[PDB]
Design a protein around this ligand. Structure first.
Ligand SMILES: NC(=O)C1=CN([C@@H]2O[C@H](COP(=O)(O)OP(=O)(O)OC[C@H]3O[C@@H](n4cnc5c(N)ncnc54)[C@H](OP(=O)(O)O)[C@@H]3O)[C@@H](O)[C@H]2O)C=CC1
Ligand SMILES: COc1cc(-c2ccc(C)cc2)cc([C@@H](C)C#Cc2c(C)nc(N)nc2N)c1
Length: 190
């Protein structure tokens, strides 16, 4: 079984990720980081998979779906475990989707809230790619959906380990867009 990882961007310290079905920020560089990391592979003729909840899939703009160069896995409790096309798979669970995929190097859980909060405690998930976002006044930002992540049982890895994981991908420190400041982090289980 290939390595599964959670990729998310959240605002400290309450780890908020959204407000009424949409993200409370537009971080141009973070968006680019998300695309490169979930797309790049190390071995030839392989591709990564992106697993998401049905609601997240529907929120993605028509021309951006499915996410290009990646296998899109959409999760719903009403779906049968079946391959829709070359890039789209419907599944009722992550373990069921892993049995249908082929030539998949890395798997990335990309949201949303219900998906994160109920897969963070799944043994299949071994890595957390959290983009920690800081703001002068976090409470000033409208938020209603948060992450229920027990980071207590996780360990913040050194930047060098994240660099190894992302390869030649540029990792900048304290990226400042507007009033937001963020960093890319890698987490592993205790
Ligand atoms: N900052 C970030 O990195 C990101 C933030 N977000 C935020 O997340 C929010 C949306 O989250 P949310 O509304 O929870 O949407 P989700 O993507 O989590 O959709 C939830 C749906 O997924 C399906 N599902 C949930 N759990 C399971 C399971 N265990 N097995 C199979 N299917 C399951 C269900 O589909 P069904 O009802 O059909 O059975 C459910 O309705 C937005 O506000 C957005 O801003 C999202 C992505 C990234
Ligand atoms: C609301 O419509 C959306 C659009 C995109 C999207 C579409 C195209 C491109 C090039 C980049 C992102 C992604 C999303 C969701 C799936 C996400 C995300 C996510 C992020 C942006 N960063 C990090 N770090 N983790 C994530 N899961 C929703």
């Amino acid at each position: 079984k290939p390595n599964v990882a959670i990729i998310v961007a959240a605002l400290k310290p309450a780890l908020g990720i959204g407000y009424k079905g949409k993200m409370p920020w537009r971080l141009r560089k973070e968006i680019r980081y998300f695309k490169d990391v979930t797309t790049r592979t190390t071995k030839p003729n392989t591709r990564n998979a992106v697993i998401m909840g049905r609601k997240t899939w529907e929120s993605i703009p028509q021309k951006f779906r499915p996410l290009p160069d990646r296998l899109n896995i959409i999760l719903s409790r009403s779906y049968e475990n079946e391959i829709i096309d070359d890039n789209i798979i419907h599944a009722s669970s992550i373990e069921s989707s892993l049995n249908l995929v082929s030539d998949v190097e890395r798997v990335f859980i990309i949201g949303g809230a219900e998906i994160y909060n109920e897969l963070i405690n799944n043994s299949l998930v071994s890595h957390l790619l959290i983009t920690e976002i800081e703001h002068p006044s976090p409470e000033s930002i409208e938020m209603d959906t948060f992450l229920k992540f027990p980071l207590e049982s996780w360990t913040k890895q050194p930047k060098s380990e994240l660099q190894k994981f992302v390869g030649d991908t540029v990792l900048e420190d304290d990226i400042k867009e507007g009033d937001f400041t963020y960093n890319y982090t890698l987490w592993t289980r205790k």
